[PDB]
Design an enzyme around this catalytic site. Sequence first.
Site, PDB file in Angstrom:
ATOM      1  N   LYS A  52      12.712  30.980  90.831  1.00  0.00           N
ATOM      2  CA  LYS A  52      11.180  30.905  91.405  1.00  0.00           C
ATOM      3  C   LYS A  52      11.534  31.655  92.810  1.00  0.00           C
ATOM      4  O   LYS A  52      10.341  31.971  93.418  1.00  0.00           O
ATOM      5  CB  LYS A  52      10.540  29.825  91.308  1.00  0.00           C
ATOM      6  CG  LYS A  52       9.444  29.813  92.409  1.00  0.00           C
ATOM      7  CD  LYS A  52       8.541  28.605  92.011  1.00  0.00           C
ATOM      8  CE  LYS A  52       6.983  28.819  92.467  1.00  0.00           C
ATOM      9  NZ  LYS A  52       6.582  28.019  93.732  1.00  0.00           N
ATOM     10  N   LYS A  64       8.773  28.738  82.093  1.00  0.00           N
ATOM     11  CA  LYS A  64       9.171  29.600  80.726  1.00  0.00           C
ATOM     12  C   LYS A  64      10.512  29.837  80.732  1.00  0.00           C
ATOM     13  O   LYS A  64      11.166  29.377  79.499  1.00  0.00           O
ATOM     14  CB  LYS A  64       8.556  30.863  80.618  1.00  0.00           C
ATOM     15  CG  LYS A  64       7.394  30.897  79.552  1.00  0.00           C
ATOM     16  CD  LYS A  64       5.812  31.541  79.961  1.00  0.00           C
ATOM     17  CE  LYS A  64       4.989  30.460  80.635  1.00  0.00           C
ATOM     18  NZ  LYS A  64       3.779  30.984  81.181  1.00  0.00           N
ATOM     19  N   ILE A  98      -1.294  55.894  66.418  1.00  0.00           N
ATOM     20  CA  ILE A  98      -2.007  54.618  66.272  1.00  0.00           C
ATOM     21  C   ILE A  98      -1.374  54.293  67.470  1.00  0.00           C
ATOM     22  O   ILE A  98      -0.142  54.332  67.924  1.00  0.00           O
ATOM     23  CB  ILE A  98      -1.396  53.745  65.120  1.00  0.00           C
ATOM     24  CG1 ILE A  98      -1.742  54.670  63.864  1.00  0.00           C
ATOM     25  CG2 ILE A  98      -2.332  52.468  65.064  1.00  0.00           C
ATOM     26  CD1 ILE A  98      -2.140  53.570  62.737  1.00  0.00           C
ATOM     27  N   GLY A 181      15.919  62.933  68.995  1.00  0.00           N
ATOM     28  CA  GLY A 181      14.468  62.445  68.101  1.00  0.00           C
ATOM     29  C   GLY A 181      13.446  63.478  67.381  1.00  0.00           C
ATOM     30  O   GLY A 181      13.199  63.546  66.591  1.00  0.00           O
ATOM     31  N   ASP A 182      13.465  64.621  68.532  1.00  0.00           N
ATOM     32  CA  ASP A 182      12.623  65.774  68.096  1.00  0.00           C
ATOM     33  C   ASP A 182      13.269  66.859  68.879  1.00  0.00           C
ATOM     34  O   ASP A 182      14.271  66.822  69.650  1.00  0.00           O
ATOM     35  CB  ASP A 182      11.257  65.337  68.960  1.00  0.00           C
ATOM     36  CG  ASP A 182      11.327  64.553  70.043  1.00  0.00           C
ATOM     37  OD1 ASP A 182      12.471  64.120  70.380  1.00  0.00           O
ATOM     38  OD2 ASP A 182      10.644  64.606  70.866  1.00  0.00           O
TER      39      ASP A 182
HETATM   40 NA    NA Z   1       8.750  35.327  92.221  1.00  0.00          NA
END
Ligand code: NA
Length: 327
Positions: A52, A64, A98, A181-182
């Site tokens: 924090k 969290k 999509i 990938g391509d």
């Molecule tokens: Na912070």
Amino acid sequence: ETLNGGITDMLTELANFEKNVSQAIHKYNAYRKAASVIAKYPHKIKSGAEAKKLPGVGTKIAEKIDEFLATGKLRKLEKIRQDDTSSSINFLTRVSGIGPSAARKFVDEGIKTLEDLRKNEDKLNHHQRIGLKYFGDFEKRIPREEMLQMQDIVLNEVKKVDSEYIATVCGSFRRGAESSGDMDVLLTHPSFTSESTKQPKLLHQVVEQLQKVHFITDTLSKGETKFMGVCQLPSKNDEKEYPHRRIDIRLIPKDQYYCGVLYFTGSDIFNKNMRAHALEKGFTINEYTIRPLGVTGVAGEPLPVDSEKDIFDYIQWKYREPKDRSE
DNA sequence: CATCTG
DNA sequence: CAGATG
Ligand code: NA
Ligand SMILES: [Cu+2]
């Protein structure tokens, strides 16, 4: 890099969901910097408060983090992992065309699996259609052995159309990559630069040829400069078919090809590394230019580039081979 | 960013 | 045209 991963990892799941599942950009970004910043943190975090103290790390996250510290998990997380809507959402997105928005929508409607989409095709768009058609090919990476073939083809026709074009498959393929990938491909032509008002033709002109030759299977979108489309390597002796591959074209001007030629190869890690030095030599780069820096703060003017070599020497650098473009 | 969609 | 998408 490894001493705070559990967390750099948890937050990241959180951002994606927020970005995908919800349309929570604000929250999404929030996890985003917070992780990477804990990410840059030299020590092992063993309290929420510890973090924090960081920038980005707010009381919410904090908490969290603690949960994580306190117990091998995150409930909100295990709850996310097992929700069918969310999971349907993330599955859905795998399709080309999509996206989050669509997902949600389609999810609302009750379509959530490759199965649904086929039933409900009438409601998908070309891209979406094409996307669902080649769900599998598009999910698989092209062997460079394949790269080599395709290119051979791009180049063969890009030439047969007009001697003056300057094709060049960018990417990892270039930086030696055994798989891509391509197939992404810069396009030029002398009569194509920064002034010269347009000439869409040059691009249409190639896209066309290849389509004509049956390389190009379908068009994703096609403009006056970019070109997104599906292609294919002609099956030889019927028993084995080539995957559908994703190909992209682009008509860049002479005055800025390599810029994007180099730029586009890489790496992400190299580009920056050379980018920072770009600065140390009295210059700046971007996907299109190698300008000189003005001391008052800034200024500019595109130095003239004709080789990826040219860009090197400008920022007093060893001409590097696309391979050694790892970082 | 350049392109498609509605 | 605003809003997706790659
Ligand atoms: Na912070
Ligand atoms: Cu320490």
